[PDB]
Amino acid sequence: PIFLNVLEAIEPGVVCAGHDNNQPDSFAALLSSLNELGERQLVHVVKWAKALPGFRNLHVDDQMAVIQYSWMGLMVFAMGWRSFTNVNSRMLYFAPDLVFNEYRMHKSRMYSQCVRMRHLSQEFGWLQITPQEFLCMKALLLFSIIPVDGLKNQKFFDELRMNYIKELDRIIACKRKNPTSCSRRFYQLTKLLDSVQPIARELHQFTFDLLIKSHMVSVDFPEMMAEIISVQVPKILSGKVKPIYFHT
Ligand SMILES: C[C@]12CCC(=O)C[C@@H]1CC[C@@H]1[C@@H]2CC[C@]2(C)[C@@H](O)CC[C@@H]12
Ligand SMILES: O=C(O)Cc1cc(I)c(Oc2ccc(O)c(I)c2)c(I)c1
Ligand SMILES: O=C(O)Cc1cc(I)c(Oc2ccc(O)c(I)c2)c(I)c1
């Protein structure tokens, strides 16, 4: 129906990192390219978000707020999916020009986090996630993290988030023959969605600490990334902004 046509239409295409693969895989270069890629994906996330049904109706400050708090989860999720469809989750497919193998995972100094990310990617397979479910789940990640003291207009946010969860229901209910399977599916997908948060939090910690010592380890942070990671990420790391979990 209408909802799905929109999600499929506004889905971003391929985004390159600009990484020079003809150079050695050093920590400095890898992370600098990961950051450039982050900067680049940020642009598409803003456009994608503002193309989502009802998003433009949220207060403007809240629009920027939710994007600034949820981009990590959004990009990690999309990446995991790309990884599943492109290389069957055998490697982290950040970008066509930035695929991480075992060696790069280690060189990046975030090996265990990459492992968590590959596990997430694999879930798409174990759970046989359909493209429709991926799209609706991803739209939901945009509405999955807010400040403890609420947004400028929490009411509208809670209403919009509810409607997106409803859409996810339709998508689940539009296939499952029996009723015990839908309840089960919803449980599986909400668990999957929650599982994204812990991974995002770890990357939040990592990039934050990395920005602090960026000058000493020669890692470049583009403008947007540097401001968001020094202004927004810290609100998450200090507990002022928290994720919305379905389960305990
Ligand atoms: C979101 C990105 C870039 C977009 C993507 O495909 C997922 C990936 C997950 C790791 C992030 C990276 C952006 C730059 C970060 C934040 C580095 O500073 C450390 C963790 C990196
Ligand atoms: O499935 C469908 O019919 C499509 C659909 C999808 C959504 I998300 C939805 O939610 C709102 C709520 C407030 C608002 O201002 C806007 I714009 C949209 C509605 I209403 C309909
Ligand atoms: O695409 C559009 O609508 C135009 C547009 C694009 C961008 I990028 C933008 O600025 C930022 C920069 C970083 C960031 O995290 C956020 I949130 C917003 C603005 I304001 C408007």
CA 53 to ligand 2 centroid distance, Å:
6
Could you tell me which of 219, 66, 50 has the C-alpha nearest to residue 150? 66
Could you tell me which of 187, 190, 130 has the C-alpha nearest to residue 164? 190
Fold for the domain defined by 1-248: Retinoid X Receptor (1.10.565)
Please give the torsion angle defined by the CA atoms of residues 66, 93, 223 and 108, in that order, rounded to the nearest 10 degrees: 110
Q: Which of helix, strand or coil describes residue 146?
A: strand
Atom of ligand 3 nearest to the CA of 64: 17
Known binding residues: 35, 82, 207
Per-residue burial over 161-172, b = 16 or more CB atoms within 10 Å of its CB, e = otherwise: beebeebbeebb
- The residue whose two tokens read 């970008």 is 95
CA 123 to ligand 2 centroid distance, Å:
29
Query: Resolution of the deposited coordinates, in angstroms?
Result: 2.1
Q: Is 169 in the pocket of ligand 2 (CB under 6 A)?
A: no
Q: Is 76 in the pocket of ligand 1 (CB under 6 A)?
A: yes
Could you tell me which of 67, 30, 73, 25 has the C-alpha nearest to residue 49? 67
Q: Classify 20 in phi/psi space as left (phi over 0), alpha (psi -120 to 50) or beta.
A: beta
The first and second tokens of residue 188, run together, are 């599986």
| Residue-wise DSSP of 82-125 | HHHHHHTTSSEEEETTEEE-HHHHHHTT-HHHHHHHHHHHHHHH
> Under a CB-based contact definition with an 8 Å cutoff, are residues 3 and 53 in contact?
yes
Neighbours of 235 (CB within 10 A): 16
Q: Is 16 in the pocket of ligand 3 (CB under 6 A)?
A: no
The first and second tokens of residue 6, run together, are 């929109």
CA 27 to ligand 3 centroid distance, Å:
29
Q: Is 164 in the pocket of ligand 2 (CB under 6 A)?
A: yes
